[PDB]
Amino acid sequence: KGIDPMSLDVFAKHNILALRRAKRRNMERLQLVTGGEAQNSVEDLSPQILGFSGLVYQETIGEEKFTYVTENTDPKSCTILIKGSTHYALAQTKDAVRDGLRAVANVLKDKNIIPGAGAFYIALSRYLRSANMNKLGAKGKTKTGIEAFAEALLVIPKTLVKNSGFDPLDVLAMVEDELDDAQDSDETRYVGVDLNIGDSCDPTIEGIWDSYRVLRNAITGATGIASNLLLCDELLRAGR
Amino acid sequence: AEALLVIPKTLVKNSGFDPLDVLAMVEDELDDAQDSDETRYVGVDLNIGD
Amino acid sequence: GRQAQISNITAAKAVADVIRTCLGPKAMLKMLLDPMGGLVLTNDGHAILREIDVAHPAAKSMLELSRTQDEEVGDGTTTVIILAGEILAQCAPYLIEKNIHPVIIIQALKKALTDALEVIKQVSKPVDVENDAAMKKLIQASIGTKYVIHWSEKMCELALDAVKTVRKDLGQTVEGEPNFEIDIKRYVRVEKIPGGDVLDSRVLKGVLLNKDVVHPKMSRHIENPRVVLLDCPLEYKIEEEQVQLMCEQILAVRPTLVITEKGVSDLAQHYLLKGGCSVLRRVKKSDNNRIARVTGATIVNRVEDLKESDVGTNCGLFKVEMIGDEYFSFLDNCKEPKACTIMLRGGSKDILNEIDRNLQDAMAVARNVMLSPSLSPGGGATEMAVSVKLAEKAKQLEGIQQWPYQAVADAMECIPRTLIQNAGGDPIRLLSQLRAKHAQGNFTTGIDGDKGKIVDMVSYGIWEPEVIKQQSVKTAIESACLLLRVDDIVSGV
Amino acid sequence: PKAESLRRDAALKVNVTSAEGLQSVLETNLGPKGTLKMLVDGAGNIKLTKDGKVLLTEMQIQSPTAVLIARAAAAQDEITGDGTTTVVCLVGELLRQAHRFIQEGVHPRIITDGFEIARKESMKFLDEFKISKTNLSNDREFLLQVARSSLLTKVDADLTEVLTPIVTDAVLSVYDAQADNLDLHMVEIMQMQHLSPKDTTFIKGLVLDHGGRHPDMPTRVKNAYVLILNVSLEYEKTEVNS
Amino acid sequence: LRELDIVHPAVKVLVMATEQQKIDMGDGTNLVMILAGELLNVSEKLISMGLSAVEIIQGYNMARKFTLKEL
Structure with missing residues (x-):
């Protein structure tokens, strides 16, 4: 609540910091940070009710003032x-x-974590293309539409270099040349697109990583949305 | 390579048979001929469709 | 003049224009553009037709006929419109160019409908209605591609127990014989119960109520409670004796249970407390008819007229034990009181709301097999097999009706052609070979949706009941002839 | 007369073109090197963001094609919370390759069926390609490179170096390491238009709006006791003015 | 600028940047508006030349740090 002018001179001699007009939602979290319970009556106040806080300093600004409860042991x-x-x-x-x-x-x-910068999209588009050609266990007519799905995953690495003015075909051939040497050896090396230099890069050293849950629902999510757009043969205008 | 595949698709399109089915039967037949160690030529039959 | 007859065929073609690709399990999704900016992506055929704004009056007649078929059966709504819509397309040059009288075409469709039903009875195969495993692949048509696909094994036990309980043969030639005499409306009505588990869900026979005990201290276990039904509740119609006098009339038989339709005042709770009977208020009026059938207590208006013939026999348990943080009441027993109450338990209300509509459509298809003990081949096999028999009977007619009779065979082949248009193959190449397979193949050659190559139905075993095929061709003729009955359209009040 | 069964694949050809128009809007908005576009509709408030979900909610689109795409960003934000622009770029580009096969006669159902087959086969490669990360608390150095992935996209990359220690230390400080769970609502957000964004710092505690103003208050108080006081320290008056 | 009604929001970006100079330092508002307007003229030749605006923005960040160190 507010502060009367009588208590202003009393708190100044003891150097007691006073506050007024406190938010109700903010005071609910003060019990967790400080640890002190809300005291409704001073007559029932106990010495264990007092909490613990660190350095508290207020910034000086003409329009507003801030209070820092920061530097706590277990905030x-x-x-x-x-x-x-x-x-x-x-x-x-x-x-x-x-x-x-x-x-x-x-x-x-x-x-689980996945590397970004087009490292997952290039590796997935190349794997799905050579997987069905070796097995040939799906269908002859179905693999025609599967090729469109593999070519649609390569737009992400081509888009990143398109905004900067780089040739999307140049950076595409450089990644495929590095993946051919990785298939011969039994080791594991990830390749990704470096936008600053323009050549390939190691996503583990560069530190570009994308969430697994985001990318897992991105392929499945975009599959159902893009499919339903092709399922409507006629736009239906009615209701008026 | 894709520009040369329009001729076999053009011949079958005028006959009415699905150009997608004739394309898959030829590619699947050429793969089995290489593993059989022989020489067999494949062509598009417009009357039957195979 | 002749302009109104053309508009009737055009209006029927415009309605079927939307559902052209909506036929079959491979039906795609449609986008309806609303004037307020909303869209409807549902692929359901009959759900879109209710929101379609139409101009020509004959288009509204197709919506009313599709609504009637939607209530009786869950599927086959778009099948009737497409089948009846293609008849006017083949009969368009016959009515105009050939100058054929419309009643002759209508009379030809009536004679063709009789011959069509005879072919359906010949191609039908016998099925065992008592087999629980045979009903699994049948009802599955309304099961698969839904959230109930995982619990489908348990869903079959819920539908079969409700149909077999309320069915009565009563075969005889005296008063007429209903086949199994099934009543879906009153007896099979389902009430959703929150909480519980789907796997443990069982079929209860009786009346269920979710109301709890109205008194703080009462015995939670009663050996044999006797249900007592009444109309006027316990309250002032001296004020203390009037309420007690109404209780003494019920206590004349010393009942151990008291059920009141309306609320119960606190004054009547103290009088019935010493009598050793539970008080239950807040009972709906529609459920009072089902309580008398599972109990036998005669419903009486005035308390003084209550008969002593009431019995509390066939009461399973009094247990009030809480289930799902709510006190329930279970009147289910070990006998069949000419009814049942399906209790659907689950982990949330959204799951129970989806199972509700799915179970009602599953039991509707279940009754379709129970009514007619025969199955018909699906996937366009039935529609093509009838068209083959139409060409043979057309040569023996020898009359003017032969021309409109042959046009029916062209409309019968449109349903299997629809599944081919959604399959992606050549429609002309497949329909030519499929027609020849029914002659020497005993109509065992169907159409496969997933693959798209013509194969026999003996392997996959796709079968549908006959009553759906009978009502599909019967309504289509009635819908196609009705559009030809109106040769002129006028406006004004 | 005139029994037709006319040739379809009208319509959607425009919807594919309509998808290409919406794709180009979010095409240059994807990636840290992309472009930042300004969208202000009727509110007179300048706002610049690359988030695909925010761009669609700030524009009124009469075309029904972009309506379904707008609903896809709402499902990814409430579950995954990221990849709003990437999904839009994949839907539009996939319609371009699928539109060329329309004139060839490829049926759209097989196009949808071919995606489900490739989606199931992608899960096998996805399990082998993914790398499991340990729950150990020594990954704070590794979390610095992961946090910069989302930061470099929405800024000019100069602000990322400032917000790198703030975002990384924000989650580890509030959440001790256990099974438990995480709640982003417990982290308060204060907005101030005065100081520059380069001078921002992380706040471990809680900040309040209206503080006490007295000239003799000390500047810094170390080890202060916090005591909640609910009683009124100011004079009170009767409900009626007196 | 407060008494003038700005229509195009692209100019509002320069107006909001001009108000920043008056609130804090209070002096140099003419140096901010004129210099920012010339940076668009010299960048117009780079956009027409075929140089992408991505490296143009990155070039200003490197040139700004070199200028602040020489002050």
């Missing part, structure tokens, strides 16, 4: 402070942070 909470000069800088940063939290969230849940 069990975090706060992401987004700063920006303009309005669009705040919306872009907020979108990048929320996209990064959900990407790391799948790392602790799912122990």
